[PDB]
């Protein structure tokens, strides 16, 4: 797996000129240092192992933060349960790495980290808490209260996590509708027709393929409500596995603006430097 | 034989050149039909061959000294090209490759350079605050194509949002520096070396076959890397022409005809 060695070379006086080329053809000149200067024989032992796709993508990255509360319910606005749409566009670090390529195909891994704290110092009484994380595929009914019938999880996957234990962990297969995920989509979902009564019959947003790509995650605490409020947050980490990619693209150069390819703010990424200054 | 002289022939049409550079095959793959072990729909496909696989010529554009660029998309640019367009609108699904030939000639005393790029899934940015708000009619220009701009001016129309693009040239219209665009298949037309560029494009998509009226899977961008100049005058301008020919086309799901509103 080591890189190719370097061959010894001597002086040259010949009719063949490897130094001249024409980039108009759309090809890169495959030169080596021995083709332009004298070189010695060197056995090469460096390798490219740490640069493969698996090694490049073998890291867990944060993608979302979910906040839930636990206090005796009133009629005011409360967060006894929360819902989050699965997507990787809420953060930029993993999005930029994925967008080097047009299509991809991989398994997925999830890890959940949970933390909690008090909000008032009046009592300081609370027992250990248990969290439920339920996955709601598209088309399934969604909860309307923290204790309705939907939480029976008859057929939806669910995780029960007890506070203070090791982070939960899950694996998921390739769940795409097509043969590969599409990071970019140049099209619409509906097309207006001359016979339509009004515009909305065909109106749609540019580059949006489907409404619910993967569903939502619903989070709650199963414990009843203690005399004092307790607040918690759940952090989700993502790691691709068994990765394949096609059709490379240039990387993003300006700040993201929404889930599309739009750009608003800076548009001036390069700094100043003299033409003849080292 | 020299690689500067080349001839192409498809259907009942022929093209000749005498100052070409060479031919490029994107990703080293030639167009082909669908295989049995890769099919998905079960209906019998239709493949007219000669009736659709031939060169069509778009309208010519004039390379001014202050022009910023032009862009097209496929198969959108070929909506009205006879039987290809008819088959596109009469069927639900479609698939085909393309061959792109760009023409531009000038004397030995002119100077300049054009960059020709073929981009898969060529998304473009909007012109207003509302994200992804451009409309179908404005996003599908036809053979007329579009243009780039030198800077981003935020739309402030009072009557209506106007729902159009606003591609910036040095950002390539999608938020990436133009310098890195050479990872895509490309060629350069340098007026002292050659006068045409040829690129062969296979079918690139995440599916074996997809709808043609909804999704565009290739984009063509032409940008002047070096501005045009002529001897001690500033009114000079020369034309540019683009020719395209579908290859290995097949259409599957038949129904009544579609009629988009533009």
């Amino acid at each position, epitope marked *: 797996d080591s890189l190719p060695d370097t061959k010894a070379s001597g002086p040259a006086h010949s009719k063949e000129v490897p130094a001249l080329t024409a980039v108009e053809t759309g090809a890169t000149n495959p030169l080596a240092p021995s083709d332009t200067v004298q070189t010695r024989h060197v056995v090469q032992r460096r390798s490219r192992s740490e640069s493969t796709i698996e090694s490049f993508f073998a890291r867990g990255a944060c993608v979302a933060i979910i*906040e839930v509360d636990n206090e005796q319910p009133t*009629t*005011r*606005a*409360q967060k006894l349960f929360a*819902m989050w749409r699965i997507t990787y566009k809420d953060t930029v670090q993993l999005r930029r790495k994925l967008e080097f390529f047009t299509y991809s195909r991989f398994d997925m891994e999830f890890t959940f980290v949970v933390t909690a704290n008090f909000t008032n110092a009046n009592n300081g009484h609370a027992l250990n808490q248990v969290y439920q994380i339920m996955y709601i595929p598209p088309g399934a009914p*969604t909860p309307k209260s923290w204790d309705d019938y939907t939480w029976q999880t008859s057929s939806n996957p669910s995780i029960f996590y007890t506070y203070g234990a090791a982070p939960a962990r899950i694996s998921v297969p390739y769940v795409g509708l097509a043969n590969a995920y599409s990071h970019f989509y140049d099209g619409f*979902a*509906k097309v207006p027709l001359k016979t339509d*009564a*009004n*515009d*909305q019959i065909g*109106d*749609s*947003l540019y580059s*949006a393929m*489907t*409404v619910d790509d993967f569903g939502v995650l619903a989070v709650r605490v199963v414990n009843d409500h203690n005399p004092t409020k307790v607040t918690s947050k759940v952090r989700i980490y993502m790691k691709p596995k068994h990765v394949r990619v096609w059709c490379p693209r240039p990387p993003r150069a300006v700040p993201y603006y*929404g889930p599309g390819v739009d750009y608003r703010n800076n548009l001036d990424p390069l700094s100043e430097k003299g033409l003849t200054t080292y | 034989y020299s690689d500067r002289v080349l001839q192409l022939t498809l259907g009942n049409s022929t093209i000749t050149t005498q100052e070409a550079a060479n031919s490029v095959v994107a990703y080293g793959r030639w167009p082909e039909f669908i295989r049995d072990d890769e099919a998905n729909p079960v209906d019998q496909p239709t493949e007219p061959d000669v009736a659709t696989c031939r060169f069509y010529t778009l309208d010519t554009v004039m390379w001014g000294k202050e022009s910023k660029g032009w862009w097209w998309k496929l198969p959108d640019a070929l909506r009205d090209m006879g039987l290809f367009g008819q088959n596109m609108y009469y069927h639900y699904l479609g698939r085909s490759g393309y061959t792109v030939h760009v023409q531009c000639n000038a004397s030995k005393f002119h100077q300049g350079a054009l960059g020709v790029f073929a981009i898969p899934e060529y998304c473009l940015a909007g012109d207003s*605050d*509302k*994200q*992804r*708000y451009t409309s179908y009619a404005n996003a599908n220009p036809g053979e007329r194509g579009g243009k780039f701009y030198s800077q981003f001016n935020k739309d402030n129309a009072v*009557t*209506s*949002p106007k729902r159009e693009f606003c591609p910036v040239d040095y950002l390539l219209g999608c938020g990436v520096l133009l310098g890195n665009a050479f990872v895509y298949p490309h060629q350069i037309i340098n007026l002292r070396t050659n006068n045409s560029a040829t690129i062969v494009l296979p079918y690139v998509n995440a599916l074996a076959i997809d709808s043609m009226v909804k999704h565009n899977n290739w984009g063509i961008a032409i940008l002047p890397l070096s501005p045009l100049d002529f001897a001690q005058d500033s009114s000079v301008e020369i034309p540019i022409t683009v020719t395209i020919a579908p290859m290995c086309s097949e259409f599957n799901g038949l129904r009544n005809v579609t009629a988009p509103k533009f």
Partner: antibody
Amino acid sequence: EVQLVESGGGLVQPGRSLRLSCEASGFNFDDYAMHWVRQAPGKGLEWVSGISWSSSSRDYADSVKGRFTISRDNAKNSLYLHMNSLREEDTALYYCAKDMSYYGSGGVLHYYYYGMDVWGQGTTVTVSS
Amino acid sequence: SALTQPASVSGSPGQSITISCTGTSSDVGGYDYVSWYQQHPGKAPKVMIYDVSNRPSGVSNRFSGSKSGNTASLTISGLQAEDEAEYYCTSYTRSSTLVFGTGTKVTVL
């Protein structure tokens, strides 16, 4: 079931700034459009501003364009209205309303504002020198 | 500009009354999003009709609506004393804004 509560109204001098607030409960506030409507004493209803389920889409009426601003905070189920360079003509009763938009026939988004089906009791703002 | 509505309409008990709201092609005449609201003095508006002809749950069948050309109409049948209130029309505009009507007051003789 569904409740909207407004607050922040008061008395201010011309040319100064004020902010209003609206809290919502009983429904998935994170996934609906919202509106602001004002009624001058003894006059008809006037549409002021509206925001869709995405903060990008955000519209204003000509009478307040360039002066007012609308924003939402899905983490607290709160809807805000920021007013600057107030005028005596702005004195009116302000309502917080919920749109029935979204939930179209699938592949559609940034829908037109269908209309309002729930109204709050409103808060009073008076501008006088 | 606000949609045009009549200043007021009068009718005797047991009769039927109609109210008209008019706009342009960038308005009622261009889209099907038209709704009607009812307001008693000192009360928040209540929705009566939406999408031109749909009634919300719990609304009496005595209310109905229709549209034609650039004009939309609200019809009240079996007029009663309690129907005395103000009514407004609303519509979506192609400039991405809602517009309210001038308003009409119903008087029961």
